[PDB]
Amino acid sequence: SSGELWGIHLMPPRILVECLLPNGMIVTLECLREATLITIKHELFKEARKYPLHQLLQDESSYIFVSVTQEAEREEFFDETRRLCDLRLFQPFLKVIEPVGNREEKILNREIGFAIGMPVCEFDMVKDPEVQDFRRNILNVCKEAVDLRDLNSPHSRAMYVYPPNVESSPELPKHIYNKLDKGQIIVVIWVIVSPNNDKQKYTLKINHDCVPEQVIAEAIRKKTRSMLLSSEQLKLCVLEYQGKYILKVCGCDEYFLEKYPLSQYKYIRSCIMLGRMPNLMLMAKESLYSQLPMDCFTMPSYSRRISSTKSLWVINSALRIKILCATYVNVNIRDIDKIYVRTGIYHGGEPLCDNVNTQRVPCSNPRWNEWLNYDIYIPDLPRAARLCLSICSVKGRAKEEHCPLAWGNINLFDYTDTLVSGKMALNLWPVPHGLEDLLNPIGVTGSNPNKETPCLELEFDWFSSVVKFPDMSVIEEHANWSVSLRENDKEQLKAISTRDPLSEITEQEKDFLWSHRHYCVTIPEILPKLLLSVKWNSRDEVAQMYCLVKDWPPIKPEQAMELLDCNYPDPMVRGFAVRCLEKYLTDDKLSQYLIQLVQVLKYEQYLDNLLVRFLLKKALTNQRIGHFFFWHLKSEMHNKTVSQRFGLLLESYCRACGMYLKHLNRQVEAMEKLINLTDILKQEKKDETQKVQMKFLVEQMRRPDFMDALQGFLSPLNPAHQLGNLRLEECRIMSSAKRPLWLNWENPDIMSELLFQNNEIIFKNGDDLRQDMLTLQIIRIMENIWQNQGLDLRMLPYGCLSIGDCVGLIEVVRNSHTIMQIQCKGGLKGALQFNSHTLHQWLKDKNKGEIYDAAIDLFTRSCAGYCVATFILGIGDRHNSNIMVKDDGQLFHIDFGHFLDHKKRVPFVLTQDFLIVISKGAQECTKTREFERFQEMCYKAYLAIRQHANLFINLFSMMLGSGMPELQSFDDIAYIRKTLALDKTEQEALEYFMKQMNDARHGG
Amino acid sequence: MSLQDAEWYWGDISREEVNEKLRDTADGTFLVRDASTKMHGDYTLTLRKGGNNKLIKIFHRDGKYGFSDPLTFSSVVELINHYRNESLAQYNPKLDVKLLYPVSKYQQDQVVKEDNIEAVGKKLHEYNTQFQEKSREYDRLYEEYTRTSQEIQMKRTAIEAFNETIKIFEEQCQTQERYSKEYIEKFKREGNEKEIQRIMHNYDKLKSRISEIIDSRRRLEEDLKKQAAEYREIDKRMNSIKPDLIQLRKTRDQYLMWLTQKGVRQKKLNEW
């Protein structure tokens, strides 16, 4: 919705509304913009008495309003409390009706529709039975989650809303343990006393592995020091406080609730790392539960009511498909010679058989009526077999070249494991930008809902009855029918598990695996390699393979996630991968990989699958991952290739997430208001000055309804951060040509001064941010790997979130400047040359005294981290305005997507200015012992990431269906195999990187 | 028997590049590299079979060659030529293909005239200039293509909203006529023309407004039909530019052959 009325940003203070009565009369009502519908209805029936046939009107209370929204929905306004201008009316009119159906349901569906960005009723109209079955059949996943979190109320409810933000392991790496005082940590506990909300603190020293109740014990024990209490009287008040209070992080909404060792909470794990003081607030449990309003879960209307076959393995015939004709093909008749449709049968990305094409045909008559025969048996079809097709043009001469016009994919079995039969017609999708392959087997399966798009018609063989895929019963028996140690081979099998997911696997190696497939369960890591070795166009091998995965040892999630990428479409394989996650994947690592776990939903062949039920289950039992679960889905609603699947998934989430839906809607409205504001600055004020835009901004933000929407809501970057009042004094447009907004809120926390008193975020509208999201996420993985190995390389994966089509939020990081900004703080030295020491001098000025050595250590460590990271990811050649540094000394890179777009020469930026500060301002700084141990950090950091190369390859592989142009094929991922030098062993990769570091020095 | 001169030995080539070469080729098309490991005397053969690029490793021992444990052939050219003659069925019965077609390194040098080094000092620069211009036009087309596509669905949902508003005003007319009819008839025999004209005045204003929004709908359906037309034109223009853009890229790129016929980047330095 671009405004309060169609084509209008805001309603005038007073407007005329055309009111249509249940008698035929039409009444113009002048009413305020902000008038609640209760005020409208009352004053309408008060004015109706001036019009004919008033006698026919029942009492005002017996009617409600209905009208048409800018989403083209006939919306029944049951919630009569809403302002006229919040309805998103298409035109200013209101139709009076008697209400019908369940009021509470209709009120709730409107709130869901606003949250997901589309009306729920649109799902009611869908003919497709898969859609209607999905809506009903996951409500039990909702019931399970709601029942589970209301089990031990209110604690279970607090654990859902405020889950423990904990590391995946209590074990500290000893470089963290070393910042403890002989194994202990000093922590300060705070309290507010009411008479005028006065603070008081209590400093404690405790074992790092105390549980929060034990912390509360040491606090009450320290205060009762002089009360002369017996050992059992002390217990009684310890028991009193342990059960009556909990601990809260000062400044944000994080709580300690589930007896993990205190050092396992991420806030404190970092307070140790950063050596900062953990500030905790003792808070009453009844106060925390007080802000947990009860939230039920009503089953919706569609949940309850609705108004022979032979096996695939008895069909003794080869596969054939009839291509009939096409429509709406946009082709220039005199530049293009002829057209044809290309087809292939795919299992994942591997053709099950050679491709076949129709004859070539004139552009002016796209009609074929050809049966295409495929070199595969119908019983040999695997369950996950897909038909991939496209319409292609040709131009002849020099070589004759073919090009795709539109593509489309079809599941040869539907969600009821029946084989398709009869005539079919599907609208094709646009060929993605940059793709030149004649087919697109990674694209989604389904017809394009957009109208006046090329529609291709087909027909599938109608065998005498409905055909279904065999039940697992007969598959295992066919394996029993079909089937009808060693040493040196053992070292090779293990030697193959080491190789990355994209390593070349030749024919001798894969059928060698298929030979020793039974020995493979001794090295379960080999499963992905063995699966690509199966000849999936043989029902003999697939059946035998099902028996092996049925009894496969669980592999850990970092490996199981590979089996959810587009190269493993079989339902039994993917089901094994999900079971690995729901028993080995922590909520911490789920929250970390959630981006990729959401993207692989696009590869799922059907709406209802084991993966979506797992993610939805976890999103409703843990509100932290449910928050980002919502936003990553919401951020892609515009993309009509998934808008239906994600929509149905959001509907079920919003229907069962509880009272948190209310909070999400306040975020959504706040973003919508910021979107519409920036669209006015972009579209309507390009032709007007910088200062004019500013005056409109302050005036526009000064309006009451804007501030009521933008003040007092949770930050989408981290919902633990409350965004209170705006510091309009500090908000601004920014110099970037896409003119984003620098926004700043006060932190309303009672003890905000102990964390940060004002929180600022950049809202940008126009740039695709999922590149920065994935890069920043990948940087956070690498830092996590380095920390747990013992490399204290500090990265800065600042917050970034896409909320829609080229729009989202970036966390501003305070007390930081760009290297360009810092050069401009110094002076010139050479002829028109900036002083190379200007960076080291600014560091000294900001870190006077003994804290100098710490800043140099922080700069050298963060610099080493980004040098390695940016090299590996092909991000090296950054501008001085794209590299930043805190006053603290911490260095970090920014605007990663800007760099990828700019692409369409150095391994990584190791400029002289950095060497000055790394070597502490020495001459020939490349020969000192500070630089000596700096390049050794980079070496260790490099081989550390190579030791985890499989994880990263899998994470990028899972993003192929995202639609990001950087990730359109596995060939795009091959670059990281070059920087990590995976087809060469360790010492070669080491020397390969050392060589690149000499080139980064610009000499040697 | 020179492996270095052989048609099908490209050598220092990546998996990505051979995939770019066997794309949509017929079964039996084949190609040989030295292994991606870059270890000396170690090689790999890729051939097309079943729409797939199936890789096989050529083992090497005691100067002999082959791609299985029993190893025989003296040179790779003897190994390859043997399987050019008769089928790989000897190795795998499910691999009935022969090494039918090679793809070779310098059988497609489409430079015709005297090899003045202006072939790269001039013609290459012209083709590259012709490529980046046509590539800039196709990027522009795709921009207003996506813009137009999104403005269209905005208009489709807007006329679909007009459809609901008109549906509601039309049932307002049919209810006005349903409930006003017999009050009109009752007023007629009481001689109360005053009340009849209040009802008519309101009905006229109802169908007066319905005409305004009906006209607003067709005025938008007109914009839509005309924007939907130029949307189809932008599409067929892209589909005409795509094969040309591909023809010019491969032309420009293969004219880097004659930079390799010098063998060093000193030549494209002139274009730097």
Ligand SMILES: CNC(=O)c1cnc(Nc2ccccc2C)c(NC(=O)c2cc(F)cc(C(F)(F)F)c2)c1
């Ligand atoms: C001068 N640079 C190059 O030549 C170059 C060539 N190939 C590349 N492939 C590649 C390598 C590793 C990871 C992923 C990709 C696609 C890259 N790296 C990227 O494009 C990239 C890196 C990221 F960290 C994140 C993202 C995104 F945000 F898009 F996901 C893309 C660079």
